Automatic annotation (TrEMBL), chains A, B, C, D:
GO molecular function: enoyl-[acyl-carrier-protein] reductase (NADH) activity
Membrane-traversing stretches: none
UniProt family annotation: Belongs to the short-chain dehydrogenases/reductases (SDR) family. FabI subfamily.
Binding, NAD(+): 13, 19-20, 63-64, 94, 164, 193-197
Biochemical pathway: Lipid metabolism; mycolic acid biosynthesis
Quaternary structure annotation from Swiss-Prot or TrEMBL: Homodimer. Homotetramer.
Reaction(s) this enzyme catalyzes, per UniProt: a 2,3-saturated acyl-CoA + NAD(+) = a (2E)-enoyl-CoA + NADH + H(+); a 2,3-saturated acyl-[ACP] + NAD(+) = a (2E)-enoyl-[ACP] + NADH + H(+)
Species for this entry: Mycobacterium tuberculosis
The keyword Lipid biosynthesis appears for this protein: yes
Coiled coil location: none
Lineage, broadest ranks: Bacteria, Bacillati, Actinomycetota, Actinomycetes, Mycobacteriales
Protein name: Enoyl-[acyl-carrier-protein] reductase [NADH]
PANTHER family according to UniProt: ENOYL-[ACYL-CARRIER-PROTEIN] REDUCTASE, ENOYL-[ACYL-CARRIER-PROTEIN] REDUCTASE [NADH], CHLOROPLASTIC
One BP annotation, GO: fatty acid biosynthetic process
Length: 268, 268, 268, 268
């Protein structure tokens, strides 16, 4: 009698046990969902990490820049879940921007090849995944992607914020296509989460100034949030994704749900 | 094992069996919630209407313009739910604007006394209710109000749209206060719902031109909505309110969730 | 050969030489406009203040809560500018909220009578003025009101922020009506300006906590603004209003132009 | 005594006499500006077109995808305007998306190589141009780019709308960098303009369905616009760009000014 009882849901984006997608997968299993996982490049690592989830789940390789992987994806999922069965949910929790497009490297100094790779992985791939998977989704289904509010510019995030602006636009178009299948498409805009990479950035991995700036941004977030914000806890974010994967928001599509403590609704 | 098992929730705004609040109450009871209802003025009528809900619920009188009603409200609720028990949820589903502030009466011709009454009932009362009820709400609790997207002007809605703009602002402030109690505050922006009053307006009760305009607005809404919009079905709206009343969006406050078929995310 | 050569423009809202409207009037006269001024209550004071403008201008009494003043206003303006002449511009620079609706008085403690008076003066009056003056405006004309960005809640501003949210909504409706006359309606959202009242508030006139909060808000504004923000200089704001009064933004209506140093476009 | 007297302004984007940039250049010259023009690929054609402007202007070659052109650009401009002189204004009026990313080709069928080229030319190039030209701009200067409101998805525009979403994000970052030079960065969001390409699209050049959809969008725009919208007249758009190039909006940066008849502020 979980929120997601009987649902078959694909979850991309697990790389470590601090990945937002690891917590999305954990909560969805706690709520009765049957998962198929996708991983990029380091499949041995990802299998070992995902062994710590409450239930075993098949793991498929998916590099979103690889056209072959995308073309075979629905067939591979169908074999993992059994012929005649379809998915009820898809989670996109994939993002990347080269170091030249984030941190202390000046905004104007990111070469376009680097920005293009970041926008491919972070924004275009949301459409790629929907194209691949809508033919094997049931009516009433739900596609969810991870967003970080790009409405205002911020220090250090730089071209990653541009990629999120493109992602929000992509989501509105995916909703139009997904609608033909009786399927919803939405993003969850999360507050900052202390993943391994984010901890490294605050520790100065992309320059001292960028680290300082991101730390300040984190502190302001909790201060602004009327219910507070705990950057070490991805669970409220994971629960929000599961809310969208459920049947409890059946008239919301092309949209953005903010799991940020309410910080974006306050100026100070 | 419902979504709202064990929760005690106050629901205002029932006047007929087509009231959005009637469907909110029905769905919340189907999901295990124990309700306290509030009604305005025609309490005999409201009791008879609410007899059709799946479970019996105490009905309290509440005129949001009446300071005495608001001052006694927490005590009356506490006696209905039993001393030592508190509310987990509050639903504001209250709206009013005099006929001079809607329909074919020119926008410039609404007297301020009429606009003020409409803003009192439709916007200020969201703060009034929160003031009255936060002292008897549990941590983890949720306050939800009903909104109609006022970001762009529209024909006929006129000063009611202005009241909704004020309501959205009020909600962001209520979230700051509610946060001190561990309580969330959010609005659900619904698409148009064919309540008795809305059917009457399309039938020309506020002038022929206003009727025509609202009919066109309804038709465009379903056309824009990537998953469609059924104005005769309040259930998707009710489910969305219950989503916010649950523990599944624990990091969303001061915010607006759109239960509109995705229509606001599309231009045509 | 000024920006506003040959234009006849009404300017409300002068009370001291630090009033934003004083600087709007000064810049418009420097740019060739012929003004009619309106003042509330302390007409002797206002006449003495306005004697410091570059050119003499007729001063008319206007209490926006007074129905008689509003009904006679067009006739009084026509006699000041001469029969057969019409206005090309109207400036609304009027705002008020009782002390119970701003500062350290808790948000929930503002009585509705006080909030209603504030919304009357600050929001409804924008429509009142347009109703009164559109019949004596020329095609190509411009109505401009003063706004403070209410998209996010902030400390101390409280019900004044709610009034601004209502004002933004009112402006979109006024644009629909003004359009019938070939007239534009827009708001200028200014950054914080150190008027006499604002200096007093920072000095603690509405409580110490509110003062502290507003000071912090001012400091953050200049820090966020990519071109900086000088709260002691109303001239950039005045120039922006004159831009809207000119023929140089002829396809902008129902809209908001931000004269805030770009602060609202940045998170930190 | 024009609006732009004494200013030196670079204008990109002229290809035909229906180019929005042709009208921007014409109005800026009528207002006293001294121009430097940039053109892509068909320089013989562009020279002949630009011979119809009120004043002669030097024409420089600029392919925004060509790193060499961008690296030599400031030097070439300096030789055209004379050593010791700098620019006061820069106009980006450059946009492109391959046919696979617009029209009736399904959204999911645009290959990433095509989308990437479109985002390079339409969004990244706004940053490229600013990088190249800020070192030769005067304090008080202004960078302006052309936008089409991408806040909601629309039929046929598809990946071009995604590129505009990215452009709006880029503009907020460019404003931060431009601020260091005392320079503003803003976009003008225009309503639809019947350029040669747009006429061709309505005539069915990108498929019949896409043509039909764009025609409907155009008709709705004028209907929504409180002051109307004339798609055959680029002059109101050009005047708006010149407003931003002037000293009359000195506190607006990282922002978007809508020259759309007010259509985006209205639902119907
Ligand atoms: N951490 C934050 O503060 C935060 C805040 C809001 C949103 N988000 C977003 O949440 C999502 C998940 O990120 P995270 O913070 O959990 O970091 P993470 O590093 O744990 O996850 C990012 C994932 O992207 C995957 N990925 C990268 N390139 C790929 C490719 N070519 N094909 C397939 N997958 C690829 C990685 O393998 C990894 O699993 C991202 O979209 C991120 O932008 C993060
Ligand atoms: N029907 C729609 O199309 C639509 C769309 C979006 C949002 N909404 C909103 O949903 C809410 C519920 O409205 P509805 O459409 O279900 O109509 P309704 O007429 O069924 O409900 C409105 C309720 O407001 C109550 N009310 C009026 N004055 C009151 C007072 N002084 N004190 C206490 N209660 C008072 C009425 O008694 C009634 O129960 C309103 O906020 C409305 O604006 C409606
Ligand atoms: N000062 C700021 O930081 C700031 C920032 C953004 C916007 N604004 C807005 O600019 C406008 C002008 O305010 P200001 O800051 O220059 O302060 P101000 O006190 O100098 O001007 C306010 C004016 O409102 C007038 N007014 C009050 N009640 C009235 C009534 N019943 N009828 C007619 N006029 C009445 C007052 O006489 C006064 O002239 C207001 O709308 C204000 O909200 C101010
Ligand atoms: N026409 C509309 O309805 C409309 C509406 C809003 C905004 N806009 C925008 O206005 C701008 C101007 O477009 P237009 O409608 O005047 O069309 P246009 O075809 O006349 O102008 C587009 C220009 O982009 C230039 N360009 C293309 N690739 C280039 C490259 N690699 N390097 C340099 N320049 C290149 C072309 O040479 C051409 O001069 C674009 O940003 C467009 O998106 C157009
Ligand atoms: C919003 C945001 C922040 C960070 C550090 N990474 C990402 S995606 C790269 C994952 O480590 N997205
Ligand atoms: C958005 C909206 C529309 C209507 C007709 N009424 C309301 S409240 C009055 C209830 O019948 N709100
Ligand atoms: C935004 C804002 C701030 C303040 C102090 N007053 C106002 S109107 C009252 C004028 O002194 N408006
Ligand atoms: C918004 C928009 C529409 C169109 C047809 N083209 C462009 S850029 C290509 C120029 O002909 N931008
Ligand atoms: Mg294990
Ligand atoms: Mg019964
Ligand atoms: Mg004098
Ligand atoms: Mg010639």
């Amino acid at each position: 009698t979980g929120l997601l009882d009987g649902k078959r849901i694909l979850v991309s984006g697990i790389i470590t046990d601090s990945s937002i997608a690891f917590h999305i997968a954990r909560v969805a299993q706690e709520q009765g969902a049957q998962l198929v996982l996708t991983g990029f490049d380091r499949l041995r690592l990802i299998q070992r990490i995902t062994d710590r989830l409450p239930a075993k789940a098949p793991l498929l390789e998916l590099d979103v820049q690889n056209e072959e992987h995308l073309a075979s994806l629905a067939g591979r999922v169908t074999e993992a879940i059994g012929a005649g069965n379809k998915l009820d949910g898809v989670v996109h929790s994939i993002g990347f921007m080269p170091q030249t497009g984030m941190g202390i490297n000046p905004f104007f100094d990111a070469p376009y090849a680097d920005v293009s790779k970041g926008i491919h992985i972070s924004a275009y791939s949301y459409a790629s995944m929907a194209k691949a998977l809508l033919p094997i989704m049931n009516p009433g289904g739900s596609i969810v992607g991870m967003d970080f509010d790009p409405s205002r510019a911020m220090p250090a995030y730089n071209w990653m914020t541009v990629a999120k602006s493109a992602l929000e636009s992509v989501n509105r178009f995916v909703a139009r296509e997904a609608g033909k299948y009786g399927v919803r498409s939405n993003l969850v805009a999360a507050g900052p989460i202390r993943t391994l990479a984010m901890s490294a950035i605050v520790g100065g991995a992309l320059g001292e100034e960028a680290g300082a700036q991101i730390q300040l941004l984190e502190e302001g977030w909790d201060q602004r949030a009327p219910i507070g914000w705990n950057m070490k806890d991805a669970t409220p974010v994971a629960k929000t994704v599961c809310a969208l994967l459920s049947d409890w928001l059946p008239a919301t599509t092309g949209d953005i749900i903010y799991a940020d403590g309410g910080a974006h609704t306050q100026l100070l």
